[PDB]
Structure formats: structure tokens, C-alpha cells
Design a protein around this ligand. Structure first.
Ligand SMILES: O=S(=O)(NC1CCCC1)C1CCOCC1
Ligand SMILES: [Zn+2]
Length: 140
């Protein structure tokens, strides 16, 4: 589990969105595994605006933050999972590292702020859903 809280937005994995998220929907994209809902309180997070390929992510199934190198956001044919079938997922970044389903929502951060959240795992890789292209999160 986990979310990003930027302004009056809450960014979560689409597959973990709650009824309250869907009842307060701003934007959602199944291909990216992302959903954004509206919040009453302002959040603590800054979104990275950059093309970094190094950062640190939180792995709940290790209670640890790991430094990683990761690929630029791409279309990755992802095998079906505990929460999704085998399919292509867009705006996905991969690193070598540990990821189980409940690790979804862990933040990946670089020197500029939050890059994305854990979205996929398996075969010794972790995938992160990028948010750095969602420029509208920074306003309104
Ligand atoms: O091993 S995967 O399932 N698929 C391969 C990844 C690159 C090309 C296909 C990978 C999907 C993202 O999360 C980590 C697992
Ligand atoms: Zn950066």
C-alpha cells in the first residue's frame, strides 16, 4: 500500500483505489495502474520534474529503502499478477530489486522529489508507475 499526496490530489495504484477514491475521482488510467482522487487537506509531497534514472524506493516486504538504477518510463508487457492478468502496462520504469504485490504504493524518489510508486514485481525486478509526466498534479 501507499500513496502520493501532492496539493489536493491523492495518487494511488488504480488496483488499490478505494470506493472513496472512485467517488472523488480526478483521473484514472488502467494502462498505467494509476488513479488520482481529490483531498480536503494539502499533502507533504513534491513531484520530481526530471529524467533521473537513479533514486531510492521503499520496499514494505523488507522494511527497507533501496537505492536503484531504473529504466525510463516505457510500455512493458507485464505478466498477469495477483491483481492483474498478463498485459502491457505503460509509463512503467524497471529496476533490479524486490517487489511483492503489497509493496505497491511504495515511493521511488530522486534528488528532485517523488518519481513514482511501486506497481509491479516478480523475476527479481520492481516496476514503478511514473508520475513525473503528470504536470497538472503541481497546480489547481
Ligand atoms: O519480468 S516481467 O514480468 N516482464 C519483463 C520485463 C521486461 C520485459 C518483460 C517484469 C514486469 C515489471 O515488473 C517486474 C517484472
Ligand atoms: Zn530527478
Amino acid at each position: 500500500s501507499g500513496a502520493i499526496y501532492v496539493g489536493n490530489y491523492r495518487v494511488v495504484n488504480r488496483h488499490l483505489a478505494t470506493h472513496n477514491d472512485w467517488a472523488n475521482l480526478v483521473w484514472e488510467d488502467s494502462s498505467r495502474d494509476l488513479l488520482v482522487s481529490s483531498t480536503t487537506a494539502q499533502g507533504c509531497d513534491t513531484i520530481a520534474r526530471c529524467d533521473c534514472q537513479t533514486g531510492v524506493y521503499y520496499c514494505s516486504s523488507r522494511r527497507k529503502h533501496y537505492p536503484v538504477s531504473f529504466s525510463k518510463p516505457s510500455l512493458i508487457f507485464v505478466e498477469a499478477s495477483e491483481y492483474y492478468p498478463a498485459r502491457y502496462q505503460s509509463h512503467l520504469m524497471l529496476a533490479v530489486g524486490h517487489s511483492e504485490p503489497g509493496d505497491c504504493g511504495g515511493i521511488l524518489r530522486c534528488q528532485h522529489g517523488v518519481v513514482g510508486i511501486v506497481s509491479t514485481g516478480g523475476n527479481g525486478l520492481v516496476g514503478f508507475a511514473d508520475v513525473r509526466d503528470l504536470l497538472w498534479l503541481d497546480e489547481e
